[PDB]
Design a binder for this molecule. Structure first.
Ligand SMILES: CS(=O)(=O)Cc1nc2ccccc2[nH]1
Length: 185
């Protein structure tokens, strides 16, 4: 692809993080902690899942960023509306204000309702995410496989400002402790 010139510097917003998460000092990495991280509760925090938002809000233009997923067994990535539900159980779908892909149990899927099987021959170690606000597009790229297309959501109805969205996943297996990292430009 040729989206690299729309690169944006994303940072994580601590205040939105599930209380288990550890965000690095530079706000560019996040991982699962092995306990509650000794923060107060607030209405922004995702309660049920190991999720966090980027600080940046987008309401126009073209935006691109990359995320390192090396050695993780489970994660979700994409964008979401600023006003998505934070508390309780919910599915990742455009109806609920999410445009995401995930890895779970050795398969990759797009967060449509119902979910869509992805066809990835080279397991990615870094994912590129492109948003075209005006066009209503969110696309995902396999940086490990020379930028090949993973998935395009088109005819998106964003219906609000967008935020970068992250889920580091659960670590029930002991094999999913590795962080999500925002890769340098
Ligand atoms: C099973 S676990 O992944 O190793 C620890 C954990 N349990 C959680 C419950 C809710 C949100 C995040 C959570 N992290």
């Amino acid at each position: 692809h040729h989206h690299h010139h729309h690169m944006v510097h994303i940072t994580l917003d601590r205040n939105t993080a599930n209380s288990w998460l550890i965000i690095s000092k530079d706000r560019r990495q996040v991982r699962m902690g092995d306990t509650h991280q000794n923060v107060s509760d607030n209405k922004e925090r995702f309660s049920n899942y190991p999720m966090v938002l980027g600080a940046q809000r987008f309401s126009s233009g073209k935006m691109y960023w990359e995320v390192d997923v090396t050695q993780k067994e489970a994660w979700d990535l994409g964008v979401c509306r600023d006003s998505v539900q934070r508390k309780g159980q919910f599915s990742l779908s455009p109806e609920n204000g999410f445009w995401t892909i995930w890895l779970w149990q050795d398969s990759y899927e797009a967060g449509t309702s119902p979910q869509t099987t992805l066809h990835i021959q080279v397991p990615p170690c870094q994912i590129g995410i492109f948003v075209d606000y005006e066009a209503g597009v969110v696309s995902f790229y396999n940086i490990t496989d020379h930028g090949s297309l993973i998935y395009t959501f088109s005819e998106c109805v964003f219906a609000g400002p967008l935020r970068p969205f992250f889920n580091v996943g659960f670590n029930y297996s002991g094999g999913n402790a590795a962080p999500l990292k925002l890769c340098p430009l």
